[PDB]
PDB file of C-alpha atoms in Angstrom:
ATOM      1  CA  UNK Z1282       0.000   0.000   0.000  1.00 15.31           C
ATOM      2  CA  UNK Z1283       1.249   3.299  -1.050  1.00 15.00           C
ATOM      3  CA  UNK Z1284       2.553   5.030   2.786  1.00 19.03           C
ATOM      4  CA  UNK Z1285       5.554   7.459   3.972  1.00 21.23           C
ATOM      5  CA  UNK Z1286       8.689   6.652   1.851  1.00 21.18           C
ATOM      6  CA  UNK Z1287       6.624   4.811  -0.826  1.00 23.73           C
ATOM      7  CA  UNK Z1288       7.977   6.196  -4.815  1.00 24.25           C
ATOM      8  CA  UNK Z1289       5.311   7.847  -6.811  1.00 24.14           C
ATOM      9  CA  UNK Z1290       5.454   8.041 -10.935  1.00 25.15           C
ATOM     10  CA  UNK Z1291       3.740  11.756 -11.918  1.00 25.03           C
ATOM     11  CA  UNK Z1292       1.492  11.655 -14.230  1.00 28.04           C
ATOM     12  CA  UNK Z1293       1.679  15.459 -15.109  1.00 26.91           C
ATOM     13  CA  UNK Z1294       3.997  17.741 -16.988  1.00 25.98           C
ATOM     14  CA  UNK Z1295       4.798  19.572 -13.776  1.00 24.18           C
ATOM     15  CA  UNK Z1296       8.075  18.925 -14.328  1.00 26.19           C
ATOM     16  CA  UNK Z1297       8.206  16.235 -11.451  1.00 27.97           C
ATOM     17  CA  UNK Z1298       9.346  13.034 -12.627  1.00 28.23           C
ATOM     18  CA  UNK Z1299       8.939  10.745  -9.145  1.00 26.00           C
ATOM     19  CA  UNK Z1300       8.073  11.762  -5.251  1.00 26.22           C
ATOM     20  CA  UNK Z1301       8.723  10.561  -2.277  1.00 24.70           C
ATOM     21  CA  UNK Z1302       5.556  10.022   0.127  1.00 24.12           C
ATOM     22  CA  UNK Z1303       5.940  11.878   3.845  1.00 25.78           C
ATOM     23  CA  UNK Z1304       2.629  11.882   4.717  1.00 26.36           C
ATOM     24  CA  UNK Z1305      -1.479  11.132   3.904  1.00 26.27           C
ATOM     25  CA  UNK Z1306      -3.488  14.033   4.404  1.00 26.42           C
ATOM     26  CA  UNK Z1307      -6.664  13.341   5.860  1.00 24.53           C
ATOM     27  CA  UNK Z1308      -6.147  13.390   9.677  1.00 22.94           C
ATOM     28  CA  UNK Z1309      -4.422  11.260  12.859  1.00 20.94           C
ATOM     29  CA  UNK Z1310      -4.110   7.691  11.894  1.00 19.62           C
ATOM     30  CA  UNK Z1311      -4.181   7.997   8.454  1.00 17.65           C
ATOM     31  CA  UNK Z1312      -1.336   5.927   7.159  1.00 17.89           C
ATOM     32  CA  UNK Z1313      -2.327   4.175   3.515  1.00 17.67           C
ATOM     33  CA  UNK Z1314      -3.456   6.401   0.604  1.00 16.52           C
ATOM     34  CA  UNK Z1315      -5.339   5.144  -2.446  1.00 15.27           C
ATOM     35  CA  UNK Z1316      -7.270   7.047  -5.483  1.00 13.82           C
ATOM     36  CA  UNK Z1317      -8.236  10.439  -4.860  1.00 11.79           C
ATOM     37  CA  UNK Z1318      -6.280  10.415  -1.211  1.00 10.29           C
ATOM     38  CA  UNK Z1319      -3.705  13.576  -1.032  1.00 13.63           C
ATOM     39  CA  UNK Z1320      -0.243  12.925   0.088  1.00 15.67           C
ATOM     40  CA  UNK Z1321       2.656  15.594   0.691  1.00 10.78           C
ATOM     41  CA  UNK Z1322       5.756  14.895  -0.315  1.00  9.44           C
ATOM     42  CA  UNK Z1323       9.027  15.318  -1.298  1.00  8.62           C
ATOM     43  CA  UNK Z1324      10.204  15.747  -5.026  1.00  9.09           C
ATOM     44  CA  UNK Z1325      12.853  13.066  -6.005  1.00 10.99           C
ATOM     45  CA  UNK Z1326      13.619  13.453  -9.539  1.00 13.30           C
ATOM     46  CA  UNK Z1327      12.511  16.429 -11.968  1.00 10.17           C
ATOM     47  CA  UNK Z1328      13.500  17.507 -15.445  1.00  8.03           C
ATOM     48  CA  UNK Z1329      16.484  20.310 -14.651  1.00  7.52           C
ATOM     49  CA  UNK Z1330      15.499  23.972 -15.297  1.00  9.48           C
ATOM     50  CA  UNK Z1331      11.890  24.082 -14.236  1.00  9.61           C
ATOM     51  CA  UNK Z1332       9.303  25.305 -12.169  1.00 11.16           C
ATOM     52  CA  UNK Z1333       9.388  22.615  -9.484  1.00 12.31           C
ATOM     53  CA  UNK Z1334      12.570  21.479  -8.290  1.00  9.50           C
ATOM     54  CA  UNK Z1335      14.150  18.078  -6.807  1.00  8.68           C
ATOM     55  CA  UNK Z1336      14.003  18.473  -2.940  1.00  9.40           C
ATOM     56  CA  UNK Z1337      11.347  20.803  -2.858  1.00 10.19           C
ATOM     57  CA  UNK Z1338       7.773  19.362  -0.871  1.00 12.14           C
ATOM     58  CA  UNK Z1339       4.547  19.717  -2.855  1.00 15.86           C
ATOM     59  CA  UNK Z1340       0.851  18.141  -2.427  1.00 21.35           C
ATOM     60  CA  UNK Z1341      -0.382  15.534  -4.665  1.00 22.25           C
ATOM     61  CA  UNK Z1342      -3.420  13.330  -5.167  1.00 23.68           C
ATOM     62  CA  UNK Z1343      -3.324  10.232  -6.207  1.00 20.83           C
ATOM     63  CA  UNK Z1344      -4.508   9.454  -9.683  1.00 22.23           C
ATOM     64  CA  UNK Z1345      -3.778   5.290  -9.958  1.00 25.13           C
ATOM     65  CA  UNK Z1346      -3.021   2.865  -7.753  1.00 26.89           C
ATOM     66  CA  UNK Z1347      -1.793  -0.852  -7.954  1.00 27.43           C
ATOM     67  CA  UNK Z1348      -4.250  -1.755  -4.923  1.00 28.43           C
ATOM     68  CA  UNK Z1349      -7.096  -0.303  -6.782  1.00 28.76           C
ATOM     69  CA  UNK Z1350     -10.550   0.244  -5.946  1.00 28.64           C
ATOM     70  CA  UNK Z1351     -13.275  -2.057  -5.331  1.00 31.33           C
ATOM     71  CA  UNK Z1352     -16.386  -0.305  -6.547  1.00 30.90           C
ATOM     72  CA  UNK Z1353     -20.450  -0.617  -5.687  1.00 31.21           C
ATOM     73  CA  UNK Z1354     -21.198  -2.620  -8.506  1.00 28.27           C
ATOM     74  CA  UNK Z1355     -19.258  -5.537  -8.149  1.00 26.27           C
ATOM     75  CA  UNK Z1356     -16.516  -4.317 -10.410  1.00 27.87           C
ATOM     76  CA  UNK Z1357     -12.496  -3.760  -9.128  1.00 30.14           C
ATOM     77  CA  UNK Z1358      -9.985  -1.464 -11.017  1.00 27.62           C
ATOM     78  CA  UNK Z1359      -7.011  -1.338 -10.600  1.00 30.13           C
ATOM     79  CA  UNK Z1360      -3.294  -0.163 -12.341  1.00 28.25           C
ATOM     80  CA  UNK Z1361      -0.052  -1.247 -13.238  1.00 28.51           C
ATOM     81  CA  UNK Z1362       1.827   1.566 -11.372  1.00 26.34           C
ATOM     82  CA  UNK Z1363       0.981   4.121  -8.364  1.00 26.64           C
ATOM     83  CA  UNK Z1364       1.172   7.748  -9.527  1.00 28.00           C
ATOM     84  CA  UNK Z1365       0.173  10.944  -8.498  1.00 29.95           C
ATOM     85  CA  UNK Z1366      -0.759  14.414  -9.746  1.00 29.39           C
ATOM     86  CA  UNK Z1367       0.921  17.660  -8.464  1.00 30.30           C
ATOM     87  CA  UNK Z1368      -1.460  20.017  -7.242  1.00 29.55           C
ATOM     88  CA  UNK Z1369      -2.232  23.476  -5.558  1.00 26.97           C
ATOM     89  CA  UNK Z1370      -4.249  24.136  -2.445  1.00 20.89           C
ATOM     90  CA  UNK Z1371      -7.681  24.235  -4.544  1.00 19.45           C
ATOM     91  CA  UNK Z1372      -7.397  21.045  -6.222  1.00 18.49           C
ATOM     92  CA  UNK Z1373      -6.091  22.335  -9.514  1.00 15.85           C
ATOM     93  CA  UNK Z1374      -3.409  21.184 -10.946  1.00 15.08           C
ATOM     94  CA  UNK Z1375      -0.337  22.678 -11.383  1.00 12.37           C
ATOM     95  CA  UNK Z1376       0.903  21.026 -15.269  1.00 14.29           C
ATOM     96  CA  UNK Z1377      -1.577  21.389 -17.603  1.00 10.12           C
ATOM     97  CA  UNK Z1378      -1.486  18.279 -19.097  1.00 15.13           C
ATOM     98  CA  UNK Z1379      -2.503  14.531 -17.235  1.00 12.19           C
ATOM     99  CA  UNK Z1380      -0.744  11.445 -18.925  1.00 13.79           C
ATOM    100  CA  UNK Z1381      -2.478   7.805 -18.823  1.00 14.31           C
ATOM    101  CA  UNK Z1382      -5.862   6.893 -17.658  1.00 14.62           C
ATOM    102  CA  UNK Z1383      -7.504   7.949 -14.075  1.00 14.05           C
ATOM    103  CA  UNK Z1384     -10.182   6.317 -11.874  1.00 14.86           C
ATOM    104  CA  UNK Z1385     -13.306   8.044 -11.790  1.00 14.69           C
ATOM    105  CA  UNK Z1386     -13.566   7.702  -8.118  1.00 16.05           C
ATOM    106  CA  UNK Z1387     -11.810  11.016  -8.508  1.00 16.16           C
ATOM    107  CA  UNK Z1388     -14.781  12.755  -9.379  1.00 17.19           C
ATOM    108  CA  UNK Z1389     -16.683  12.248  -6.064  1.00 23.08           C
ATOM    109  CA  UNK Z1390     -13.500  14.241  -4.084  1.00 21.67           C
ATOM    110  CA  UNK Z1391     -13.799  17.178  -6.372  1.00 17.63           C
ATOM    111  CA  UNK Z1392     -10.872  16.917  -8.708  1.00 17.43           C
ATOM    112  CA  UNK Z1393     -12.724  18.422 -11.587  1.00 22.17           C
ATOM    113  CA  UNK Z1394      -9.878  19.958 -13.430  1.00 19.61           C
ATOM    114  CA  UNK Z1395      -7.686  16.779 -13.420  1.00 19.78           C
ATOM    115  CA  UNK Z1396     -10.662  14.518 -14.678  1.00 21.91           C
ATOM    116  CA  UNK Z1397     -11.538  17.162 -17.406  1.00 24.00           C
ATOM    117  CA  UNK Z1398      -7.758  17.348 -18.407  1.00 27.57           C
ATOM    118  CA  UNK Z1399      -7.633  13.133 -18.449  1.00 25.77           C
ATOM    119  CA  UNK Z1400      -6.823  11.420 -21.490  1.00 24.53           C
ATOM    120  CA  UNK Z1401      -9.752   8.872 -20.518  1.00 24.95           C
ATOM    121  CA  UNK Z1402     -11.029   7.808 -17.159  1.00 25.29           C
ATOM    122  CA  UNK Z1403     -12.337   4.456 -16.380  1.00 23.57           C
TER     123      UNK Z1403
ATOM    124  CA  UNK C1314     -10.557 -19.681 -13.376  1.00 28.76           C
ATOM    125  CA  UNK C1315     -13.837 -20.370 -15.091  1.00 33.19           C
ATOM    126  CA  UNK C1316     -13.238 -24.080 -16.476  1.00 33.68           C
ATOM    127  CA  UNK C1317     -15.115 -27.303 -17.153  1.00 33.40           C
ATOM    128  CA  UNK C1318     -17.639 -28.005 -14.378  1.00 33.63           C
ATOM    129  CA  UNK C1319     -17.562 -24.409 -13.269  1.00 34.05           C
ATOM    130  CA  UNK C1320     -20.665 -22.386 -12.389  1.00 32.28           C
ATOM    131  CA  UNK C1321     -21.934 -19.370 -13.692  1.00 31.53           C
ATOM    132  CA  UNK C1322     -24.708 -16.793 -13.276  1.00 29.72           C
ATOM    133  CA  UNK C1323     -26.431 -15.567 -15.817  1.00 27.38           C
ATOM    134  CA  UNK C1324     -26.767 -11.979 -16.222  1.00 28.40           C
ATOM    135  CA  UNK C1325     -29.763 -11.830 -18.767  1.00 26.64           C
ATOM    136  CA  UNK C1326     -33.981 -12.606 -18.719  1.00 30.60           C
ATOM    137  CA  UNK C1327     -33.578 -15.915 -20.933  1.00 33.43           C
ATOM    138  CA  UNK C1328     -34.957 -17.676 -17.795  1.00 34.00           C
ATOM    139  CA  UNK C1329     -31.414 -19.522 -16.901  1.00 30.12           C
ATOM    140  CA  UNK C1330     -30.858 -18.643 -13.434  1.00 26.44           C
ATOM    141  CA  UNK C1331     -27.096 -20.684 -13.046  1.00 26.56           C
ATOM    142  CA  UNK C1332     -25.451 -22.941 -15.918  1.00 27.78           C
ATOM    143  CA  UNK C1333     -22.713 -25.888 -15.314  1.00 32.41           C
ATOM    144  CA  UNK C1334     -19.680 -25.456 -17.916  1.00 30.47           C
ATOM    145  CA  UNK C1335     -19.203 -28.855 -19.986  1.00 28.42           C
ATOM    146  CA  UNK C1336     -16.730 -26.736 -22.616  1.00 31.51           C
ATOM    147  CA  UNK C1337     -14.783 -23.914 -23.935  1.00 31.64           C
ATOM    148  CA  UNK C1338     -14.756 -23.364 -27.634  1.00 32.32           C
ATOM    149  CA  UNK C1339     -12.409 -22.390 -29.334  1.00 38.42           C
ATOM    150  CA  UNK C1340     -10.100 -24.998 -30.022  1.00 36.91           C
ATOM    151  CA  UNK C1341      -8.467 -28.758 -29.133  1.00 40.08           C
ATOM    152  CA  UNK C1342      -6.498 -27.276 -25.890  1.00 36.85           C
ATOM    153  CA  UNK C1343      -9.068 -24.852 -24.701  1.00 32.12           C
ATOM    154  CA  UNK C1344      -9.560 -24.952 -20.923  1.00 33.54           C
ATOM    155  CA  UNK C1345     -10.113 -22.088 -18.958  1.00 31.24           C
ATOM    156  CA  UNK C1346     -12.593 -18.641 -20.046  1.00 29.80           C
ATOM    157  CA  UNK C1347     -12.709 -15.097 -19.408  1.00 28.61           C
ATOM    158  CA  UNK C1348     -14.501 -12.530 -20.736  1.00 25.03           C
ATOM    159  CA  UNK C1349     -15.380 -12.618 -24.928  1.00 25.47           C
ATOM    160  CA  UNK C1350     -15.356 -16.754 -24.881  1.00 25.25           C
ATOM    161  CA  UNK C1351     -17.600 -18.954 -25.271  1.00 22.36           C
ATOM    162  CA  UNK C1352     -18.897 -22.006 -23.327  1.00 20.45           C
ATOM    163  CA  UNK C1353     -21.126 -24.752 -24.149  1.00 18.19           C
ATOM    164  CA  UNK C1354     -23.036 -25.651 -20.903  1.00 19.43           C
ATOM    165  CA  UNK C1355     -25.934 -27.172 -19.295  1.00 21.64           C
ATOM    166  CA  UNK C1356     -28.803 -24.941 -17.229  1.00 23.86           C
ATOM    167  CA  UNK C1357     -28.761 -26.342 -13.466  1.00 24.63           C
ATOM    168  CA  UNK C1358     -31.405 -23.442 -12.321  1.00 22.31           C
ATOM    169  CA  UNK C1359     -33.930 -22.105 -14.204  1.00 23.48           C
ATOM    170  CA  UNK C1360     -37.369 -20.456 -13.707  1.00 22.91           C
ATOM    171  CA  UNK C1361     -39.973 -22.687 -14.334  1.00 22.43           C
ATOM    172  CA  UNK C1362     -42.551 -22.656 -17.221  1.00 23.19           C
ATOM    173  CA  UNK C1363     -39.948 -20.713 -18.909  1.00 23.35           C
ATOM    174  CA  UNK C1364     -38.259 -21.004 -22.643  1.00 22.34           C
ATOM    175  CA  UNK C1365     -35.004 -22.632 -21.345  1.00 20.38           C
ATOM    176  CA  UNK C1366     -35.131 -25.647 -18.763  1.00 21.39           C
ATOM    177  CA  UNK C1367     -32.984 -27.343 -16.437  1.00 20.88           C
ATOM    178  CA  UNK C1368     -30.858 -29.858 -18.095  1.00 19.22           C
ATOM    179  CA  UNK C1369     -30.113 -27.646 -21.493  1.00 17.91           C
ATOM    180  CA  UNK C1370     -27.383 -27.352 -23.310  1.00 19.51           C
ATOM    181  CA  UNK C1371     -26.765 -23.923 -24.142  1.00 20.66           C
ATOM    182  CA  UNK C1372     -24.268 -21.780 -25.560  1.00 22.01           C
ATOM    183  CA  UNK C1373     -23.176 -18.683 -23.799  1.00 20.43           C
ATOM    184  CA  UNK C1374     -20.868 -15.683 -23.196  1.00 22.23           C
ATOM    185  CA  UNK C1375     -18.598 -15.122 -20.794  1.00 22.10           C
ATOM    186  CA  UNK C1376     -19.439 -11.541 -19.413  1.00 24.05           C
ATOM    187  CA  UNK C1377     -18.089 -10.947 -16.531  1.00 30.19           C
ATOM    188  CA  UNK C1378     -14.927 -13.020 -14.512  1.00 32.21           C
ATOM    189  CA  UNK C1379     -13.348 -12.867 -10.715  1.00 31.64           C
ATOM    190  CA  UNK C1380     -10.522 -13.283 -12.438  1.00 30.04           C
ATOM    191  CA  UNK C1381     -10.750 -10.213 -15.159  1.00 29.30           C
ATOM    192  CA  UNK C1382      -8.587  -8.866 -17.644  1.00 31.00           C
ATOM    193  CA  UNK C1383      -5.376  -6.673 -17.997  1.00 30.71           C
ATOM    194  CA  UNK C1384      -5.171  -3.782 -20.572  1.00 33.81           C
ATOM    195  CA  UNK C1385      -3.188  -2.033 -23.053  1.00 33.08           C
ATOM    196  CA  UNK C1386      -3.659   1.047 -20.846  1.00 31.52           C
ATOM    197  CA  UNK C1387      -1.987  -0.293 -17.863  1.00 30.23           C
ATOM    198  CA  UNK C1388      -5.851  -0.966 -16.270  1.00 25.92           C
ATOM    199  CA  UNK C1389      -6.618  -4.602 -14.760  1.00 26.98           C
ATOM    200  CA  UNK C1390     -10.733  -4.794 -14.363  1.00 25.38           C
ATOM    201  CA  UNK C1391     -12.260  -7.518 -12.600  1.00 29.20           C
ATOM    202  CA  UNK C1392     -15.789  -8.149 -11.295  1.00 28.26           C
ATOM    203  CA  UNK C1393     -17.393  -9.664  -8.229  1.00 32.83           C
ATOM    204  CA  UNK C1394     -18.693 -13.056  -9.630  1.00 29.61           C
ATOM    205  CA  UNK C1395     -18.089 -15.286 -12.784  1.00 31.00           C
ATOM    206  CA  UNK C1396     -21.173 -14.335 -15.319  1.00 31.52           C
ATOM    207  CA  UNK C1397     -22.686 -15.315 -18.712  1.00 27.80           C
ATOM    208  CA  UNK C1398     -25.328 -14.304 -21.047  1.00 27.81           C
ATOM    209  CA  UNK C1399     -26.964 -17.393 -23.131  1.00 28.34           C
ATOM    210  CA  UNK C1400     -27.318 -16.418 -26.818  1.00 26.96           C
ATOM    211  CA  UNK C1401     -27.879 -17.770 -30.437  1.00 26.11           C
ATOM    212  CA  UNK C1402     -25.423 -19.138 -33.155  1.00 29.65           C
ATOM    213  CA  UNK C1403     -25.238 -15.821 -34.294  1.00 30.11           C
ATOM    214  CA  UNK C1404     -24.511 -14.435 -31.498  1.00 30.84           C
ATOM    215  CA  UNK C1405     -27.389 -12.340 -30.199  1.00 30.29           C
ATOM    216  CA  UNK C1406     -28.676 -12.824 -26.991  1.00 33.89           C
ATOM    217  CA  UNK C1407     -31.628 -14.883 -26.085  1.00 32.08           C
ATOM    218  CA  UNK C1408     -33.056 -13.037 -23.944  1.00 31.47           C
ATOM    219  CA  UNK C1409     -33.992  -9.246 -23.744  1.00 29.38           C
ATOM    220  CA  UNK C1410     -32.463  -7.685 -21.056  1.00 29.29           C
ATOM    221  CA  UNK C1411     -28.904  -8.038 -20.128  1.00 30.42           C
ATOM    222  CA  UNK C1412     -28.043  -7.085 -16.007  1.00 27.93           C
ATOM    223  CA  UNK C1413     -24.958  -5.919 -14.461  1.00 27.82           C
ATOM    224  CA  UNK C1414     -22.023  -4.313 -16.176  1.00 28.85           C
ATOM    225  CA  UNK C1415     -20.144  -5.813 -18.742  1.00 27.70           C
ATOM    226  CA  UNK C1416     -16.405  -5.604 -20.090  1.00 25.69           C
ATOM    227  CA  UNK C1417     -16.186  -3.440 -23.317  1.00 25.55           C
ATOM    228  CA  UNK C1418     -13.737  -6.155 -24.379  1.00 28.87           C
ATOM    229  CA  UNK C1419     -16.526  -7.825 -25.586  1.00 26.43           C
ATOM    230  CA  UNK C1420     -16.812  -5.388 -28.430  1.00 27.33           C
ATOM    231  CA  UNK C1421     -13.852  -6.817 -30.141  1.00 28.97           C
ATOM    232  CA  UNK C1422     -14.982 -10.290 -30.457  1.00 29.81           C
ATOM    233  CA  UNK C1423     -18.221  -8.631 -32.113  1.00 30.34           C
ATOM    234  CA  UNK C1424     -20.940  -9.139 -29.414  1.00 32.36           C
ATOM    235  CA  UNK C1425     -22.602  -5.999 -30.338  1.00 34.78           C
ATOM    236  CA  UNK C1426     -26.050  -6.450 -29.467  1.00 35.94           C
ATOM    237  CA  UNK C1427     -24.867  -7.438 -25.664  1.00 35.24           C
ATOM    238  CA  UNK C1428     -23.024  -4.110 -25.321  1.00 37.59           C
ATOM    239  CA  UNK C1429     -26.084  -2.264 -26.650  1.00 35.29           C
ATOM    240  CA  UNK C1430     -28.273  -3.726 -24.401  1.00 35.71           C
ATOM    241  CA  UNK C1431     -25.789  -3.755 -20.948  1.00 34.21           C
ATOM    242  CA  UNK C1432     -26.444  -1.299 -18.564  1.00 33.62           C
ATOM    243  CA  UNK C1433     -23.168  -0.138 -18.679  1.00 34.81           C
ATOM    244  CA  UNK C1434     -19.840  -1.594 -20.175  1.00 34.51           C
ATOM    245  CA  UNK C1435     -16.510  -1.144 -18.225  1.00 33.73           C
TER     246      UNK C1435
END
């Protein structure tokens, strides 16, 4: 399960190429984050010369997920790969592009933007 | 997985409540189905008075599978219980009403009247 020190892929053109989970958002005891959770954490690699650098600590929600979701009618999705999406305080995205399918589960958390912007969500 | 002896649900109004797999087509070496194949079974439930009786042999669809599918998008779908819908040598279904969700990969082995009629397709 994706927790503190677990690798994320970005699926954005933030810049950020892979984070580094410190935390799940969401209150005491939180530990595991899945589809549409928001994690802070710590960029580990980024293309040089941009807007967000390696080191720096940003907020992401998480767009796919390996576990996957099990959903109310009788149907389970899940991914090949855990990634994430970079974004700002109000949901939004900071790239403006989003690379690869997302869950729709993101819809019900209020990620708008990021499921307009989706190549195709499932 | 679904194989000889396995049993299924059916997810349509033919009147077959549960069928018994006796084969996969397909093929000398066929053995196990997922979604898109087709089995040759026998009806162990039915409702009664109805077209199709217990002790049948039908033909049907594999629609839905505990064991799913993995995609060319990185996506791995599975479902909740191991599902069928009886049709005809040409393919259509037998009965009117299809229930449940069903995979979209059953587009590409041309069951298009099933997807029209599902409630949704996955």
């Amino acid at each position: 399960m994706i927790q503190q020190e677990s690798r994320l892929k970005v699926a954005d053109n933030s810049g950020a190429r892979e984070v580094l989970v410190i935390k799940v958002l969401g209150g005491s005891g939180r530990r595991y984050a899945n589809i549409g959770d928001v994690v802070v954490a710590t960029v580990k690699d980024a293309t040089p010369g941009g807007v967000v650098k390696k080191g720096q600590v940003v907020k992401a929600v998480v767009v796919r997920t390996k576990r996957g979701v099990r959903r109310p009618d009788g149907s389970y999705i899940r991914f090949d790969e855990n990634a994430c999406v970079i974004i700002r305080d109000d949901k939004s995205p900071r790239g403006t592009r989003i690379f690869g399918p997302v869950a729709r589960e993101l819809r019900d958390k209020d990620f708008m933007k990021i499921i307009s912007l989706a190549p195709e969500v499932i």
